[PDB]
Amino acid sequence: IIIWFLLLSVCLGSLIYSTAALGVLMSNLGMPSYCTGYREGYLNSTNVTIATYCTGSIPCSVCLSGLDSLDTYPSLETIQITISSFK
Amino acid sequence: FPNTYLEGSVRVVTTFDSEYCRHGTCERSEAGVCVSTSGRWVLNNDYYRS
Amino acid sequence: HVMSKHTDFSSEIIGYKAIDGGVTRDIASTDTCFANKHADFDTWFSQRGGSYTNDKACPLIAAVITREVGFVVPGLPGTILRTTNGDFLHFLPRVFSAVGNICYTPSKLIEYTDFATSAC
């Protein structure tokens, strides 16, 4: 029962990896391919973050792997800190 | 942020018995009035009073 | 992804500033690591005798520019521009020449030298 679902998840992950490999081959040799649309739309878009552009979709994020994004900077964060109370 | 009545080189502020927070830093202060000769951040506590 | 260097808008830049913890701050020669996207910053820092190592876990470098470049994103200082190669850039536009790093009060805008000891 559970084994069938695990195998389905493995096959879906393998298909996603195949699409990622196709995208890598595209970035290396061109290329008119599966991942052209997402990257072409994202390059001209004003969305500095991938979360708002891809809306959390897995294939869109997979096609966009390898490009610079605002989310890559950890120094822009600011952890809220409570100062010392008293003596 | 607390209410203020003068801004610039010299500042005057008023506080209540509640904690105030700014960007990345929250602090606790008591009600009162403070006067500063410089435009630095001011709150009513022993640390700033020293 | 590996950061790259670009030289666009080099003639419009007066100086450079550092962004640490989401707040812009001045640069000192004792700092040892930065995240950089510009090549002229190497000449800017070498003339002062400084050396550094590039890493993503270090304060970013932003250039003070006299030309309105990029667009404003809420929550981020200055302006953000994306290169033709996909890399992003940061700049500090200004209206008047006497500008360092400016922070926002709820009513007015006041310059500061240190965020920890200012009305920011």
Tokens of C93: 């536009």
Please answer yes or no on whether A83 and B28 come within 8 Å at the CB atom.
Answer: yes
Contact between residue C38 and residue C58 where contact means Cβ atoms under 8 Å apart: no
Q: Do B47 and A85 lie within an 8 Å CB cutoff?
A: no
By the CB < 8 Å criterion, does C46 face chain B?
no
For chain B, how far is it from start to end, CA to CA, in angstroms? Answer: 22
Place of tokens 């994103």: C73
Which whole-number Å values give the CA distances from A66 to A20, A71, C57, in the listed order?
11, 13, 18
Query: Using CA atoms, how far apart are residues C87 and A41, in angstroms rounded to an integer?
Result: 15
- Chain B contact for A76 (CB, 8 A cutoff): no
Give the dihedral of Cα atoms B2, B6, B10, B15; nearest 10 deg: -20
What residues in B contact C21, CB-CB < 8 Å? Answer: 24
Separation CA A15–CA A21 (nearest Å): 10
| Peptide bond between residue A31 and the one before it cis (omega within 30 degrees of 0) | yes
Q: Answer left, alpha or beta for residue B26, where phi above 0 means left and psi between -120 and 50 means alpha.
A: beta
Chains that touch C (3 or more CB pairs under 8 A): A, B
In B1-50, which ranges are E strands? Answer: 4-6, 11-15, 20-22, 25-27, 32-36
Q: Which residue has the tokens 């040799």?
A: A29
Question: In this complex, do C56 and A68 lie within 8 Å of one another by their Cβ atoms?
Answer: no
In C2-120, which ranges are continuous DSSP H helix? Answer: 40-46
Q: Do C120 and B23 touch (CB under 8 A)?
A: yes
Q: Give the sign of the dihedral formed by CA B35, CA B36, CA B40, CA B46.
A: negative
Chains that touch A (3 or more CB pairs under 8 A): B, C
Give A-chain residues touching C58 at CB under 8 angstroms.
75
* Residue that is written with structure tokens 């805008």 in the block: C109
- Cβ under 8 Å to C: A residues 36-65: 43, 46, 48
Q: Could you tell me if A42 and A68 are in contact, meaning their C-beta atoms sit under 8 angstroms apart?
A: no
CA atoms of C67 and C13, how far apart (whole Å): 8
Q: Is A72 on the interface with C (CB under 8 A)?
A: yes
Reported structure resolution in angstroms: 4.9
Q: What are the two backbone dihedrals, phi and then psi, of residue A28, each rounded to the nearest 5 degrees? A: -85, -35
Q: What's the CA gap between A22 and C120, in Å, rounded?
A: 49
Chain B partners within 8 Å of A83 (Cβ): 25-28
Q: What are phi and psi of B42, to 5 degrees?
A: -130, 135
Question: Is the distance from CB of C90 to CB of C79 less than 8 angstroms?
Answer: yes
